[model samples]
Every structure is written in structure tokens, then in C-alpha cells.
Target: SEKGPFVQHINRYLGDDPFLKQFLPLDPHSNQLYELVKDGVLLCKLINVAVPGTIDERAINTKRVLNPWERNENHTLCLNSAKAVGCSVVNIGTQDLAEGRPHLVLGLISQLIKIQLLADLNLKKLRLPPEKVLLKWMNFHLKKGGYKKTVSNFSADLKDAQAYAFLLNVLAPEHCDPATLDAKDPLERAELVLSHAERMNCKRYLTAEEIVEGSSTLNLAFVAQIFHERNGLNDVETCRDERCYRLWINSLGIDSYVNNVFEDVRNGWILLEVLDKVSPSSVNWKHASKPPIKMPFRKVENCNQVIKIGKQLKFSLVNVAGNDIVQGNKKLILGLLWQLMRFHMLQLLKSLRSEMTDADILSWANRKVRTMGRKLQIESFKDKSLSSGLFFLNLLWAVEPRVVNWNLVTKGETDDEKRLNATYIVSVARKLGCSVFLLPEDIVEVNQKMILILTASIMYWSLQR
Candidate 1:
């Protein structure tokens, strides 16, 4: 019931789930057992085009003018990058101020710039506006001395090394493409720069042997495994730290992590060394893989089978049945029918053997007869049954070309097999290309139609009864 620091009331109000109940009645007396939330502060690392003040002074100032959209995008990039590096915003903040190390804040500022640039470029493709929530969160906490002050002095003291590590970790990936990096959210765009610093610093602090030995000691095989997979390095090559770093850099794009000045310098060195050897044609690259084939249509069940089979074969289906399923069964059915039509078209070409003869017979058959048949079939099958009887009749007309006009048969007439002929027509339709449409609604409708047909047949029998 107090204005602030209401502990007993807060605890009583917080109900316990079984999962939380396991940790209930936690020892409140022990300061070591308490968890605390840390605040995120935007610190400027680099000053490109100055508005009026010093970077550090402007960063600590509440009155600094920030472009809201740009600043939000910048902050989001930094926050996300920090998360990628296995550091939370709170831990990063703690590290920024650890041991009163003011220099680390400079790196954090650089990280801000790098992260902003990368995010801006990447997000443009997605058509998302820069995040504004991060800017607000940063501003809200900064004005409150959230970064400068410590949440728990005891924890800070106990984990000084951790705080320092956190500080160093957050700013290690700040390198950005300088052209895009100069936007208003300079503080938010510096991940690759920070990552570079982190990677370099790791080498400076630990020897290759030390890191290797420590990997085993720290049980960091999983991290090594991820690096191995990322770099596509062999186990033997990954086991060697230097080889791992080289492969890792190649895979991760070393240029992204290097400053443009250094990148240009390195390129210049390479050019100077290989001036006589370098050739434009030799440097050109082309994909060894084939272009992916587009899937026009496929059966849902067949599509699923192909997907599973393709995965096994290290190939991929262009469209999936599951994706079509979400678009609804009407779309799926239409797609499947289109595929059936394609199959029939192909079969007609193969069966007719148009290439075997230079005769205009095949052309006349396909153009005048087959086309007309398809048009008539589409029209006739527009009813609810969606039957392909008309299409089959058309196909038979194309094949025989002799049977022009004839009478359709009914159920009963001695020696008159109209029903049998109709059944034969359906079978031939399947061969010529008839696809079943199976939409979600079609499933229920199918059974309902069958029940209605059966009930009508029974009614006819009952009339005789």
C-alpha cells in the first residue's frame, strides 16, 4: 500500500503457476539470489557530420535532436546484434559502464552506427519502416540515468569481469558500409564493426592454444560445431583455430566486418601482389547448378510425396501442397486439373507421333478436333458432378474420327449397353487426362452427394416394393 517498493503486496498479488510454484518462497534475504532488469542507453561512438556538440556529451544529453524513424531502426539493429552475440541490453549496458571504463562506451557508440546502416539496407527490401519503439525505450531509460547508475552495486562489484566482458562483447560488431552508415541513426548501425572488434580482441586476449584448451574445459563443442557448419569446414580444419577463423571469415563475408579504409588497403595489397596475374575473365564466376523448374500444377497428395522425395533427393519442389492447402482446395483443385490437362496435351503429342510424319493430319487433329473437344468438355462439365464424360466423348471422337452422330443410351433396353458405354467413356477420359478436384468443402460434399444418390436409388426400389 506504499507509494513505492511494495514487496509484500506485489508477492501476494502474483499468483503461482505450477512451474513458478517450484521456485516459490525464494530466499529473499540473500541479495545474491535476486534478479534485476538492466536499462539500455544509446551512446554515440562516432561523429561524422556534427550538428553542434561532442559525441559523448550529446549522447548523455537529453535534449539531443534524433530523427525518430532512423533512430528506432538504429537501436533495433544494435539490440538485435547484441542479442546475436549472446548479450542482453541490460548486460550490454552493465558492460558499457563496467569498472568505470568510459572507453567501452565509445565502441558501443560505433556499434550503434554499424547496426543502423546494415538494418536500413536489409529492411528496405522488406518494405518495413524503421522501428520507433527502440528509440523511445532508449530515450525513456537514458533520461532516467538508467545507464550511468547501477541497479545493484553488489552484483556489479561481484561480476565486474562479466560486466567488462559484456561491454566488450556489445561493441565488437560495428563495421558498416560507410556510404549508408552516415544516416541519422549513427548510434544504432554498427554491428559488423563491433563483431570485428570482438573477434580481433578475442585473438589479442587469448592464444590459439588457450582458446582450444578452454573450449574443451568450457564444454564449448556446440559453439565449435555451429562454426564448423557455418563455415562448411571439415572437422580437422575446424579443430585448428587459425583455419577455422579463415574459413569462418570467408563464409561470413570478411568485407562486411572490415572498415572501408582497411578493406581498400587490403585490396590494394592483393592487387599490387597479383597485378600481372589478375584477369577479368578469370575472376568472373557462374553458377554450376541448374535453374529451378516452375511447378504449374500438381495433385495435393502427389505434391506431398514429391516434396518428401525431393528433400531426400536434395531437390526442392517449387510449390508445396501445404501452401496450396492454405490458399483453399478450390485453388488446389484448379491447379491439379491444369496439371492433368498438361499431361494429356503431352500424351496427345506422344501418341499422335507428329514428328514421325510431315503430314498435316496431326496438325488438323490437334487444332480443329482436340481444341474443339476441350472447349465442349469444359462447357459440359460445368455442372456440380464435375464429371469428364463429355471430355471423354470428345477424346473418343478425336481418336476414332469415324463415330460422328449416335444416340445416348438409358439404364435398361435388352442388348442396349448405354450404361456400360458410359462407364467405358469415363475410363477413357482418365487416360486422356481427367483430374479429381478435392477441395476441403469437396470432401464433405462428395459424401453428401453419394448419400443423396443412394437415397434416390432406394426410393426407386421402395416404389417397386
Candidate 2:
């Protein structure tokens, strides 16, 4: 009842042993040893005993014999016995064996096992041991995606962490090893290595100037001022706080004010002055005050004079039909007002800067006029007709400075009369500047009509400016 003598031998000697029982093949075809398992716990054994190699032949011969466990007492002893008989006991997983030649598998396994054993022995002596040193060296060039010849070209006697460190010390003796350099995890190890390298390469000492320059400790007030200069900031009360200043400076660079500080300040001042002049606070007057009277005699005389001047200058106001009286009076009044405002605006410009020309004054006035008109809901007055009047005014003012001072023609008027005359013309002109003067006064009767028209225009202008 010795059924297949090898099977009987296995059943008799190693079958009852839990360690060797799991490893015993169930059938002849399954006799090849791919791995060893004890109580379902697999061990690292990659001996392909079915193949026609040295280990395979030895395995077949060993299976044929009766004394299978003669020299092999334990699992370790069994593995050693296989090793002695030129059978590879080390497992390098299944990657190599899948494509590797049967003859070379044993040799490779033996070499790999020896390398790992040496690595473990050397690593145990050192406090900090580099694991995966051989793996890292092998896969270093393969990390980046390209075909590299130098990846597997080099050979080294040292395979693991300690050996690599020993070689490193020989190259750079002074370089200190970081504590976490040989971490178990690949990422952790790489990170540790990078950090150590950075620390080693970093400068030990920095200059005081460099430290100050590099540090983010900023004087935000100065930075804010710089920002303010670059961008015209008007809301002083809002941006007055430290928080606003810090936010502004943080968002905008510290050198903001360095570029155009003077020009910015000058322009801000001019804008502020213009705003004050047009603001509601400064543009108020008493309604009870007696309106200034205009001399009928002088009005007719000036009209005649202006008409003569217009004819001489070829600058007659464009005549419109159907509302001849009203439109004619408005055209006259507007022409006179424009002349007066041009004089005042020119004076203001001269006071500010002598280099300021009539064109600059006219340009500034046009922009302010349009802006104030929009603000006052007087957009209806901002038509081509009004623009023509202003253009005519500019032309006359540029050509003949004397035309702007038509109010000076009346030398026989009282101070109240003169003030009324000058004030009435300026007020109407200012309202025109604000783009609100759309209608002219109804002056049917001689002296009273002229006085009422002048007074009313003056009153409205006083309220606005």
C-alpha cells in the first residue's frame, strides 16, 4: 500500500508536520515549488522545482528518495539544505521569474539574497539605517519619464542605506546627516533629504540691510501716502484710519508716492478748490437783498456797441425765427455773459499760472460746465447751441481781450449799479457754465425790464454758485 513512493515518503515524514504539510504538493503536476506556506502562512521561497534546471532536477531527485527529511530538521534547515544543494531559497517576488531564464533565476536569487543579508547586517550596527538604498539607486533615473541608458549602467558594491552614507561621507566629509534622512517611507525620506540639503546650502549669516529689506515689517503710513499719490484719493475721513492705510499699502506697493507726488498734490488742490467754488455751502445769498438795477440807457448803448463789435469781428449770434424777441435777447445776454465769464476764468487761470492759455481755460471750463450741468439736471442746456456760444466766447476772448470787459463801458453807474452789472453778467455766465441757463428774461419795457432781467439772473446765479 506504498502508493507512489515519493507521495508515501511525503505523507510519512513531512505530512504530519504543520510547516511542511502545507508545502507538500497535492499532485505530481503541482510538485513545482513556487512558494512555501505553513498553516496557510506563505514564506519567501521562489524555487521553480518543476523546471529542468539544477534546483528542479534536485527537487525531482529529492522527491524520489525516502530520506527527504534526513538533514533538514526545521524550515530554516530545509531552506539551508536546498541552498547547499544549489537550489535558490530566496524569493524576489515573481517579476524576474515571469520572463527570466530558468538557469539565471537561481543565480539572481542567490545574489539578491546575499546583498540583502549584507545590507541587514551592516544596517543593524548603525543607529540611522537607509532602507531601499538599492531600490532608490536603481529607480532614481526612472523617476523622470524618459529612456535613460545611465539608469542601469552603474554598479556599486554597497547596496543599502549604510553603504550609500559611507560613500557620501567619503565624498563630502563635512556634511552633517539630518535625523530624518533615512525615513522608512520614500516620500518622507526624499523630503528629509531635501530639507537637509537646503539647510546645508543656506547662508549662515545675513547682513542687517538685507534682513531689513527682506522682512515684511512695513511703515504703512508712508506706503499709504505713496498709494494716495499714485491714485487720487479724496475721502480723507474714510481712509484716515490705520486699518485703511494698512490695507491700501498692503495691496499697493510702498513706492506708490515716489513717482508723481508733486503733480498729484497740485491736481488734488485744484480739484478741491473747484469743488468748493461749485459746492452748495459757498453758493448762497439773502433773498431779501435788493436786486441790482440795470441802466436802460446803458443797455441800449452797450447793445449797439456789441452789435458794432460783432459786425467788426464777424461774430453775429445765430438768429432763430418764431421767438425773435426772446431768442434774440437770450443770444445777446448769453454772448455778454460768456464774455464776462471768460474774463473771470482767464483771471483765475492767470493767477494760478501765467503759462495757462485761453485754450486751457476754455478746456477746463468746458469739462467743469458739462459735469456741473449733469449734476444740476440741466442736461437739456448742453446742446450744440450752448457749445456754439461757448466756442464763440472762446474765439472772441482769444481774438480781442477788450470784448470780455463790455461791463466797463458804463462809467456813469453807482457802485451798486456796477456791482449789479458785473455780478449779473458773471452769474448768468456761471449758470451757463453749469449748463442751466436755457432761457432769457422778458425785457419789454426799457429801464425796469432791463433791471428786472439782470436782477433775476443775478439772483438765480447767486443761489447756484
Candidate 3:
């Protein structure tokens, strides 16, 4: 049952890198120990002769030769005497090395290994205690210090909430014994950690100076727009309410003027400004008009939906073409939108490739293919041609060659032209998982009529091939 040969093979393949070799030596040890412990005769042999007894002469002699420094430095031969007394009192049934002066066991084992006395020591008899208490004690001690610094320190109080959260998370887990600590369910731990952050007054951690700088009029208006959009308050009357908009106005010093509300966008801006200068508790107003202001532009889309989806591509559509666009399901809409944008981007890039010079093609392909392949796992096309786009590149390279060249990997090197280009291009092609070929002459641009002829010929040959 020994895995010695397999261990040796693994070690040999990993070369002689010291850090990696350390792990390689122990592969067979687990299996060998398990086999010995499982067999009745082997277990008996281990328990009988290997188990330490009082007056262990062999252990004493081995320690004398192995740890002369420990004996001479402190003029203490306690190790020799302990070996003679045979210390086998198990504090607990577990075998954790971290418990009950495990460092002492480690020192003793070093001597045992040095004198080749591993056989004499009954390692199985050395039991480790429950680690729960020790872990909890350490964690509790660290939390007190972290809480004091986070709450009171002038410098730490000025830090951002995110940074404070990170520090608390790092220190909170270490105060407990591993066995006593909660199970390693990360989401549960994240909730616990975030709860601690909330208790620490994360928002207050932001310095007054940072708040002033980040909450400018422009930024405040931008954020208010987003907030209004998020809360479905698209109408000017609802979104620009003096009472309801207190949080945004107070956060940023914008004045709100409701009387001069004739100009729509300007009115919204002045309304925000007016609210900022006065507390909402002091304001009095009759009910304002709604849908007229909300639909002022007369666009089919709601302003909120336009701001949410069209402002910038924030959400991704899953399996884009797989779902119905008009389904009105937000998740499906986002997923399909993601695919639509990606396909559109790909089509644009494909059109650009056909007219590019060889150098331009190399530059463009090197930039786009490597980035896309790494980001989206698209690997195809060695040479640059619209006909030699991703689909063709993927198909040709699938059976053409083994060598790969990724631009990020070969961006700066003075290697030969053909080999380096091929290596760089092939790497990106492989990343796309494509089978494509690039003949040297195929990179050139032909006349428009010839391009059409070539396209037809390529389509026919590709279908046949």
C-alpha cells in the first residue's frame, strides 16, 4: 500500500525547487503510516517496542549524542531525564501538535530525527488536547485592542469605512482556537464580519475633509440623479421634494428653490439647491404636479430606466441570445443585453480587420485577441483578416499547430519575427480554443472586387474543408 514510487515520480517531475520539494517528500508517509496502523501485527509491534517506558536507556543515549548543546548551554540534562522517565501522559485523545507544549515535543523530535531514533519514539502515543479554548482566548484578546484603536485613534478614525472594515475582518478571525472557531462557511462569516463593521460606525470613519471634497455640487447632483433613478422617483416633483430629499441635500450643500420652477432641468437643479440650504422640517408646500414633469421629454422609456440601463453598461446579460428581450424580466434583459453588446463589438472589430495593413493587423490582433481570450475565454485567429476572424481563426487553429503566442506574454521581446509572432498569435488563438491557419500572403489587402471574389472562394472552400 506504500506510495513511495508515486511520490518519487512526483518529486522528480517538480525538479529540485526547494520550496516545492518540501511537499514532495511526504506523499508516501501518509499511506505507509495508515497501512501500519490498520494491520494487527504491525500495530502490535509499534505499541510494544516503540512505546516509551520508564528508564529508557536507548532514548537517553540517543539524546546525549544528538543534543549536546541543550545539555551544555543551560547545564541542564532535563531532556535526558524526561526521556528516562518516559513522558507519555496524554492530556487529550486528539493528535494536534498545537496543544500542551507542542514546541517541547518538536524540540525532542528534532533530536530524535538527528540521532535516527525515530523508531524508538512512539509518535502515535503523543496526544493533542482540544484547541477550542486556546483559539477563543487569542481572538478575544485581539478584538479588544482592535476595537479601541478603531473607535478612539485620531489617525484610524480618519480612514475610509472600507479600509476600516478590512482591518476588522483581518483581526477578528485570529482570536480563537481553530477547533473552537466557527465552521468555514464564508457567506456566514462575511455577514458576521459586515455586522461588526456596521457596529463600528463605518460612515463616521470618513474624515470631514474627504466628505467636503467628494460631495461637491456636481458630484451631489450626479449621485442624486442616481438615487432618484434607483428609488423609481423619475418625476421632477417627486425627485425634487424638499422634505424627502434631505439626506442628499444635507450630504451636499446645494440650494433648493421651488418658486422658480418654470425651467425643467434648471428647476430640478435649483430645487436641489434650495433643499440643501434649509432643513426639510422648516419647509411647507402644497401637493406638486407629477406625470407632466415625469414625461416631459415624451420618450417611450422612463427617465429612470434610461439612466439605469443606457447611462453605462453596469449589468450583464446571461446567455444573451438564449432569452426573450421583451420578457420584461430584469435578469433576462440584463443577460441578453450583455450578449448583444459583445456581439456588436465583435462585428465592429471584424470589419476593421479586413482593411488593416500587416503591421496594423498584428498590432490590433495582438491587443484584442489576448485581452478577449483572457477576459472572456475567446481563442482564435493567428493572422488578421475579417475572413480570418474569430470563427475562422478558431476553426483553422484547432487542427493547425500546437505553439501559441499571447500578446501579453510576448509584448516585449527581441526574438525573431516569424517565430515570435507565431508564438504570440498561437497562444491567443489557443486561448480562444480555435482551429485557424494564417498563410503569410493572406495578410495582404486586395482590391474591393478581388476582396469579394476572395470572400466567396473562402466561404465555399471553408464549407468544404
Candidate 4:
């Protein structure tokens, strides 16, 4: 009746049969014998031991029998006998076999093995107690099933699993309030839990939309409003057309072109309107005394010709300090000055009894300004003005044959100097009946205005014969 002799005797009776040999342990004290017998029983149940064609039908019974562990007196012997013959205590029902229920058995085994692996991981790596490890495994299962009545028979089990997962993942635990978890509506509780985990950076709980679309859809209008609000345009409406919207956004600030041309004018020259009218005879020889001898006309004719050209030119004057001078219209201002220069030269040519073309007129205007040291030479003008068209206007007006350093009039050391220059130029311009329309307290503005006036003068002389 000893284990060793008994196992040896059964092995001899089996002879060539390897089924029992595989399950039986060579040494009586071997611990692997129990596990081998247990696996053998599972294999037998899978193939149906009671069927004639199955393994050891003679040993495995058709009748329902009490489990070896349940019997009080012969428990040890019964278990050993069952193991020797590879018979399971649990029976496979007829209906279960008919429906190929072995699939379910395989699934259950697979799940149990997975849980065991996880439990081993918890025990070795996480240093958890075996009982607690098993409990967590069960809880994880319940949580995955969404904690329904059948799945979550014990509410404590679901809570324990949820808490364990949350702690393991470093998610916010306060969000898993008991009241929310125990809510009557399962869907609401599920959403509450998932939303909390998601907010805390849990990756396992993304919604279906996120899973399918990679990210949730957003309200473009709402996003646009947020941007606008940040930029201090909370009341602004969103534009529908993309191109128009881009243009509107780009146009939000002041234009640099206008700022650069008109922001300061006092540093540059200004055009003065002579309120005290000059006639051919009243002309001051002080400036015109050294009329170029290279000219074909009398010095008096140069004076008379300039006055005559001035008279032919007409300007729409704007009132400043109770006096009127041309200044308001930008185009009109430039056009008038261009004409003035052309006609003045043409009249000079006529006084000399010489005929010239348009190119001749331009040549004469260039010479006239250069003679006064007011002409903007090609290279010098390019360097000073860059490509600004407004500076070109200034060059055209320099044909007036007078050079005034407005910088001298608005003299100062700093911004104080700038302020003084702006003030003095505005005062002088006003006194001369020059239109100060759109003029600001800046040197650039004054310079722009002056350029406009000079342009009108030059254009006036240019347009006439």
C-alpha cells in the first residue's frame, strides 16, 4: 500500500500503454506528480473518457460519482486511483459535448492562465500578497465586464479593481466617487469613470469617436472666437471666406507705408505760398541777381518768365490761419507742380526764342534744380529715398531753384528739437497761407505736405508750353 510500490505495480500492468505512464511520477515524493495527474484528467475530459473510442473507457465511469476530495474516509486512496487512470471528478454533460462546449473550456483555461501570469507578475514584480493578487485579477475581470449584476455580484470587487487600476496608472482617484460609481444608470457611471481617467491622462479609456477618428471633432467657430477674444476682438464676427478672413486679419494694424511717409515732416523742407504777390518788376534780385550767363535770355526775362509760369498755374487752396494755399488734394497737388516746372522751362525757351521737346524740358528742369544745389542727383536721390515714390515727388519739386534747410527752422537736440521743428514749420506754413490739411505734429508729416506743394508747383510749370 506504499505509494512507490503501488505506482510501480500499476505501471507494469499498463505494459505498452503510455497514457498512465505519462501521468505517474517515478519517485513517490515528486511534487510534479499532482500537476501531471491534474493535466491528464483535463485531457481525458476533453476527449470524453466514457466513450468506447476514447482513452481508458473501462477505467472512467458513465455513472455520476462523488468527488475524491468530498469523500471522508477513502479520500487519499480515491484521489490516487482517479489520478492513476486519468479520470476527472467533473463530468462533461451530453448537451455540452453536442454543442462543442470544449471551446468554452479552452477559453476558460486560456483566461485562467492569463490571470495566473498576471498574478505571478504582481507577486514577483509588484511585491503583492498572493491573496491580494488573485483578488485584483478577479476585480479586473469584473471591471472589464462593466460591473453588471451578473458580473459584479459583489460591488466591493468592482470598486477594488477600479481603485487598483487607477493607482497603478497614476490617474486621479478622487474622480471615482462611490456615489457616481454606484449610480443606477450604468452608462452614466461608465462615462463618469472614463471621463475622469481621460482627464487624468489615462490611455485605456478613450471614447469610440476618438478611437475611430484619431481625435474628437471640434467647433471651428468656437476656436476662432477664442483666438479673437485673446487678441481683444471679442465682439468681432468671423468671416466665412478664407481669403477674405486672411486679408482682414492682415489689415488689422496701421499701414507702414503711410506712417513712413507722413509720420514726421519737420526734418525735411516745406513749400511756402508767397502771400505777397510778386510781379516781373517787383522781383527781388537778391536771389536772382546771379542769373546764369549761359542762358540766352535777359536776367529780367528769367524773373518775368518764372512769374508768368506761376500765373498760368491754378491751385485749389485750403484755408489755414485765415489764408488759402493749395494742399488738400494729393493728386492735384502733384499734378499742378509737375505742370509748373514743364511750362516754366518752355516759357524760358520761348523767351530765348528757342524750341525744345519734352526731353528738353526735363533736361532744363534738372539743370535748373542742380544749379541751385536742390537737384536730387540720380545716385544721391536713390540712396536718400530708396524707392519711395513720395521722395521722387520731392525731387520733381526741387526745380523751384531754391534750397531751404527746414532742419535749421526746426532746430533742437532731441524729441524736443523735433517738437520745436514741427511747431515752427506749421506756424510758418500757416502764415504763408499754405494748406496744412492732414498735418500732424511730426516732421515727416510736414515734409510730405511740403513735397506735395512742390510737386504742384513743378507740375504746373511742366504742363504749359
| Best by the TM-score measure | 3
- Candidate 2 local lDDT, 86-125, one digit each (tens): 2343442233333333344345444333332223223221
Off by over 4 Å in 4: 1-369, 374-419, 426-450, 457-465
Could you give the C-alpha RMSD of every candidate to the true structure, in order shown?
29.2, 44.0, 29.7, 44.1
Weakest ten-residue segment in model 1 by summed lDDT: 45-54
Instruction: Compose the digit string of candidate 3's lDDT tens values, residues 48-145.
Output: 22222211121111221223332221111222222222222122111222122333333333332222212322221222221222223223443653
For model 1, residues 337-377, the per-residue Cα lDDT tens digits are 23322232333334533222212322333343444545542
Alpha carbon deviation, residue 310, candidate 4 (Å): 27
Clash count of each predicted structure? 31, 1, 36, 38
lDDT of 4 by residue, 417-441 (tens): 5454444333223222222221223
**TM-score for candidate 4:** 0.16
Q: Rank the candidates by lDDT, best first.
A: 4, 2, 3, 1
| Cα lDDT, model 4, residue 324 | 14
- How close to the true structure is residue 271 of candidate 1, measured as C-alpha lDDT? 17
